[PDB]
Amino acid sequence: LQPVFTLKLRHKISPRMVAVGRYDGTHPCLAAATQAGKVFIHNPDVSLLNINQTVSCLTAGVLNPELGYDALLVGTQTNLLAYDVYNNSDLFYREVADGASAIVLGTLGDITSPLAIIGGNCALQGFNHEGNDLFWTVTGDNVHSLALCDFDGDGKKELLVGSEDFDIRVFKEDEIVAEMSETEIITSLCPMYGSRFGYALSNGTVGVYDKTARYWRIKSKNQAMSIHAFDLNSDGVCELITGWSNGKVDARSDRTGEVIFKDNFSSAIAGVVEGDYRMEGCQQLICCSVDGEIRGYLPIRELSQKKQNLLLELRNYEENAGVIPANTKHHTALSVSLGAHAELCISTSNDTIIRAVLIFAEGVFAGESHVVHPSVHHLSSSVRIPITPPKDIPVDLHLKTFVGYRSSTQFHVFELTRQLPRFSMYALTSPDPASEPLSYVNFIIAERAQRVVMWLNQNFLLPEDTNIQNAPFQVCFTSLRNGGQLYIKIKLSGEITVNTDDIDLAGDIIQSMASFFAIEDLQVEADFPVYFEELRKVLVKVDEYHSVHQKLSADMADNSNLIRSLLVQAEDARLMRDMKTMKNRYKELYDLNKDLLNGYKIRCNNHTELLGSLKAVNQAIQRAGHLRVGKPKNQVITACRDAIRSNNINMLFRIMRVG
Amino acid sequence: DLNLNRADYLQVGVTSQKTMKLLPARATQKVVVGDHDGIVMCFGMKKGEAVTVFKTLPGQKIARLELGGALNTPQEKIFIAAGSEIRGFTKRGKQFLSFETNLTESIKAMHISGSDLFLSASYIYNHYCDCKDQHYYLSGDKINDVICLPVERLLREVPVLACQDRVLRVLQGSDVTYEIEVPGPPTVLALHNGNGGDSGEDLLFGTSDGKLGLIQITTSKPIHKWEIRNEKKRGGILCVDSFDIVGDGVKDLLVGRDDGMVEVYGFDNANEPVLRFDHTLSESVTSIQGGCVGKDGYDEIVVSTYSGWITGLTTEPVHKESGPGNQEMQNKISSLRSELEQLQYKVLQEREKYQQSSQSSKAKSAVPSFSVNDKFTLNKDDASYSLILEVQTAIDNVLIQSDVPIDLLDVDKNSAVVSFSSCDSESNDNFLLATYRCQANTTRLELKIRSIEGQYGTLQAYVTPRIQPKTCQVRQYHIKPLSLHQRTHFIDHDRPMNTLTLTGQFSFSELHSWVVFCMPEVPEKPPAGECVTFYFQNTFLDTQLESTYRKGEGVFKSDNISTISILKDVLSKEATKRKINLNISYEINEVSVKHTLKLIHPKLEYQLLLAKKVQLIDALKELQVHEGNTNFLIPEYRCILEEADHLQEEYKKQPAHLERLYGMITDLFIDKFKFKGTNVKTKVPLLLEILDSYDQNALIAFFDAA
Amino acid sequence: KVYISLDQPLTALNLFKQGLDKFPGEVTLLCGIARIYEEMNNISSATEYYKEVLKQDNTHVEA
Amino acid sequence: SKWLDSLSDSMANIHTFSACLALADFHGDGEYKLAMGDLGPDGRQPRLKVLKGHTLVSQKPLPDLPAAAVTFLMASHEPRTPALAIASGPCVYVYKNLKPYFKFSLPSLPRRQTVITTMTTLKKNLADEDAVSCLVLGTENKELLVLDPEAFTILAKMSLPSVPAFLEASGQFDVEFRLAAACRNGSIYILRRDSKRPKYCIELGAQPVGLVGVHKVLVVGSNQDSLHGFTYKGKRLWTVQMPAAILAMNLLEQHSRGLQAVMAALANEEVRIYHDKVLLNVIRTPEAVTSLCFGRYGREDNTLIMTTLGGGLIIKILKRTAKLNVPRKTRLYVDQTLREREAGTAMHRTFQADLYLLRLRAARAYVQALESSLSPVSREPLKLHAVVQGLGPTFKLTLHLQNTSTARPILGLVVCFLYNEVLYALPRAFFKVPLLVPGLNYPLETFVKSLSDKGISDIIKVLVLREGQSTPLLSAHINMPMSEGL
């Protein structure tokens, strides 16, 4: 197409902080963050707003439907501000203390007020037109992106949270629905379809999701900064507009990801957003760069090359009817070695050799590959690759074993898919009751100890010689990322004792076994002494950190007032040409600045420690709730928060102990 | 201002350089091309479809194709030279000439001037007259192209011979009259008109570094007229031609590249060129011609593409008709539909048969061979080789295994992903293991490789195409010891030369083999005369490395201590390999270290100023956003507020340059103390601290004292 | 005071009318509304609010 | 909506003027191009640019800035394109077919040459589309050179009293020529036969910014934002007022309807075509326009091309189908007037008594001030007032003193400060004053410094007095503010 309008704005736009809003009620304008912590507004002249603080989120929507004005939202890692730009007046200036890493604005399920959802360290929140907490829940890790999409087709939109844990969860008003495990820290979600949402990562992968599966996916360089679904071709179905790190804006399709429209810029793309600037009654598509240029749009031979490739294949087969016996089969085998890695051995029942292996896995290896590649003196039939995943998520290696002779210049590439199970680590060993861990979680299962054997055999790399059916059923694994243990014991009544001192591991085991045995709800009995006492000590340190921060803030405010008065006095001395007192004022200012910088270092270290403590508290809540499936989860979370606002720490721990 | 629409024509197999031609035929001309399997063919493109003519039988790889005529008759005889012989066809499928010209290896260039036939070889050059040897030359370097000035507009035949070492030897008979010097190794050259220049004779050359020129070869000296030395238009000129496409009345210059770029140069200044239209193609152009092939009455450019896509760029619009709502798109779509259906049927049945017959015990599974036009050149403006792989099909993944500490930089034109797999450097000899998957349907892949002044060794690259058996082909490039020395034609002897002499029990061919092992750009075949001299030059900083050697003696003069130290070590290693026990005798100019340090000083000064300015760039930018910068900012930092962008984008590359400079300085120090017989591997950290301070006078003091 | 310090008159006025919804006839709140209207310099409403203050106090020195 | 818009562009940096931009046939075949000598984006790079269609076809550098560019037929032998005579420096570059064809030089002066500023053409005998035209140059030296058809020899030399700025040539040169010259001194001079000197001048009161000749009336655009239609004899017949400044005036002539109307490129982002007295076909532009041209550009007899003050081009093709606030009085007023009507005598008497007592007390205080001499304004003319500046322990105290007399200086005066020596440390509490010239405010400043560690504000007196007398001529007081010390 052709850019229906273009303009150059002299201000650097922060990438993910862009919004279009009719701040005059009927006159749409652009809001975008900038350096120095200022938010600029382009009316059709640029008007600055002094946030005086490093912005981290920005949107614009209808927060009180009684009036027809868009409210400019501005999030900061410790604040959140709604702003009626027309009649400059704060709708609500809330202080979060959890941060603003990703915000949205819409209507959740069974809530009659458009909420300003937010995402911080590990906890989401929600505020109405006045700033009252109406929604609050805890998630796995740092939230990086949020959007509102009606997964499940019931007319009330659930919210999709992209955790730093590489997961995408869907949250109802209170309940969690589903979670799909992507492969990197999410960065942007955008819904415009019924239950389809477009997602981006920090690998560079831009993709599309139905309910719980990916329509398409494309991984490139220049990881996407901002994705937004629009209808560029006017065919009635939205397409994923994307703005990449180089400048390319590629409007793709929500079908198999085929590029439909393409454009380029001079710098990276800050934000792609829809909004009717030109007042034509139909939406537009504005692309805003990082360097501050805005452009707005209104809504062939390769197959012959494939034919030639097919003819080339036919040429190869006719030539047939660096050579290798045609009956060469690559056979794999997984195992685990302690003296500390999951080994994968590949071999060939011939005299042929494996010149190189190029394993391809998304989140296990750093990068996407881990090419092994023996030296010419080391070549042999069977080659072993050591693997060390960072977390327990079932991965699917796409091995490409380069098969050929010793002195060859061209040889085959045999492709093979092998899945490392969820708990690929934790080799089986012999239980030593002297080293038995004390922390344990207990719960009951339905029936069929044989089905428990099935779960254990399909989610763990147990050796062949294991034979366990019903009664004793005590298996002791030793972790490989640590030295810890993993005791799965089963009794006749159908009670599962997990003796892991780690709590995330027990949570993973419980959730996997619930999703395996088709279980909806469950309540546990968990004890984590050495972890609970640590959380208690963190909770104790919290208020001390708060008080220290308050003292330092008051002191620094006093010194800043002194510095302002001294600047005025120095200006007066300079204007009356009294150089001695001017030098005196500047000496005083130098000393106050040094004191203030010392206090600044102290306060910054204290604030970092306090943020760590808050994230620890929230991760504790989330790991306590995470240990329970279905409704028994939600309860805990609520109770846990209601146990912090009251400082009933013992009852708090009782909520996370029994539920 | 000019617009050319990309209309595609028949697709032929993979083609070499200058393997396309146009029969002169006022209507549409005919296109003739040669595949790497020997199937020379020709078509006319009557209406949309290629009406093929005399598509011949497969043979050797067609290395060159040229049309000529004996007398002033319209030239129509098309001559090819596939393996070692020149075959000749008329303007139809009747072969008339087959000159065996029994040679050793192959032909790489050939020119037909009526009956005169000037052919090249790896090193050899022959001039025949109707299957009769009349001139024979053996250059010291490989030949890229041969041309003869118009024997009609002039009187004597003066064949020009473009060598690999940046020279054009304009020889007559069997001996060079003189040699013209040109920047970069010449690759193509053709008289710049249908006659050879109005003012008598003119030769237009194009080099592999990317450079055009108009050397006017007189009887005894050349007259340089202009040069099109480029900056952003890097890419080896593989083809060039003259044709009036703009229509002003003077013929324009249609020039191809190696990165797809097709360019038209107009002479609107009436004496000098100017670019008018450029277009990228995603593959490597191998031949360019003017005229018209489709819809006579509109001049167009015919461009032969490496994989064989004989494309045209027409001056006629494509959407000539419309209404309320073209159909040729639908026709081509339907044709490709039907063809892909039937081919899918056939190849699926054949895949079934092949997979079910692969289980046969005694049977063997053969491999589809293919071509990878690689180019391991050396960028001179930088110190980084720029490897460029090309495949006819699309690539799936490229391995980059190494044996040398190497930096793989990023190329914006490249669209692949990178995956630096965790090497070990202790159990595998691989100090580098990369893996560039190529997204979508890309043929060529350009990747940078930066190697230090030392650390010789091999470098492998496994390429896998998107074909069905999915084979892989390995390439072994070499990073030479002195991999940053670009060979030139002259040095400056007034520099402090730290000479060094090797003596004892050499076969001159073996010493030449050592120097080929040790130097980037030297011919493999030992040059005749048993006495050869080469004039090298370090590209990171200008220090010459004159190398002279005879049957049993060698003098390696230099301006750097590092170069001669590396040469000493590597030549001693080669001797210990081949059981020689040679005799070294070195020498030092006690001021050479001062000269090298004075050379280095500006670079370190620039890097430190870079760091110091980029430290304050953002702090000053925070002040810039307020009060509009009318009266307060100091002029000093005001000089940085403008160039902040360039400063910030150079700071991204700074740390590599700083680390390289520190390494070079520490190697210089260690070696210049090693020549005296000492071992000063321990004083390094003090030197590191000094460089963190970088008092140049204290630096030279620490150099001279300890 | 806090809202006036952040240069937000229309927030202070809404807060004052909220307070008057709580305390139906407070004189200090009406006087603050009138002060804000006079700082914004639209006397046609400051006189109305000072007249309300008078209807409440009738000895108010300010109004 | 009579003006059909054709092209509106803003990247075309075309900073020409309304006189160095002319359109005519340049290669025959009835295809009119438009040649303009465009300055630099600022005025540094003289570049000749020609326009065909609406794409630029040739721009080429020029020696110096063109002062005018007008076309004309040099001879009738097989009429090809007219010749483009572009004026630059003391030279006239005559281009034939947009190619350098001749370089006419101006005959020097006894060296002290001159420069040519204004250039138009004049008809020889035919005055049709195929006639031969002769140049008329306006040298910077106050002279008018009536040239030859081929730009090599002089046919006439006319003497003007001031440097011309705009020119208009009416009629045929041999028998009836009228040359109107708008000069820099704000005057129009008309040149007729046999008159080496005009002798028929008309002053505009403001410098003429434009000059366009209608067949009978001659319009002159004033710097006062108006047009003034005069007669060719030297008698104004009308004047019309513009709402904004006049940037450039050209002529819009269509022979189909016989409409020959003057234009106006006003500075308020509009252009209004003006006939004798009426306005019509007023247009708008995204930016005020500096040059307008109306002719047969391209292939339309009604093309009008216009260049924005900021650059860009706007080409328009003309279609051929052309109650009071009297206060109110309340019950208080009528009750007060009733009290006044019933008790007027007592009010009169008591107000007269109060006025007597007020005169008494004012005279008392005036006499007391004269006694203490505390008036900073008080034969013997002076005026002094003391300003204090600055917070902190050190204040700058500047006495602004002034002699207020017709012409008489005051020689011997001196200033003495009276302070509390325990609170303020005045370095020089007594100093002479310079010779006070009548009419100048002398600021005489001192540095007061607070000594009290506690904030104490005490008055400081200043006395200005003669050196032979002991009674202060005048005085002043200053309440020193608080110290804000340390």
Add this chain to the structure above:
Amino acid sequence: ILDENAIAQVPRPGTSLKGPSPAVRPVTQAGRPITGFLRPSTQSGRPGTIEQAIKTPRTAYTARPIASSSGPFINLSRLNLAKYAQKPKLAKALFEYIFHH
């Protein structure tokens, strides 16, 4: 001047703090006609620069001259506020003393 807290820099005329004409009502600044009932919270306009604010009369922007910034019964450094905080009856009067005295 030296303290910026307003979010909007150039807000709409009519929503920010930063009648009879000067031919009738006396004035104090370019605008801002004289008011009745001086209160110590009156700003009545604001200066543009520190120099203008210094080189003007000290009481032209406030009811009082502008500053640079806005034995003993009990020594504040001797009492442990952590012990008086336990007793609210003492703590309230003690805070009022510390704050207002």
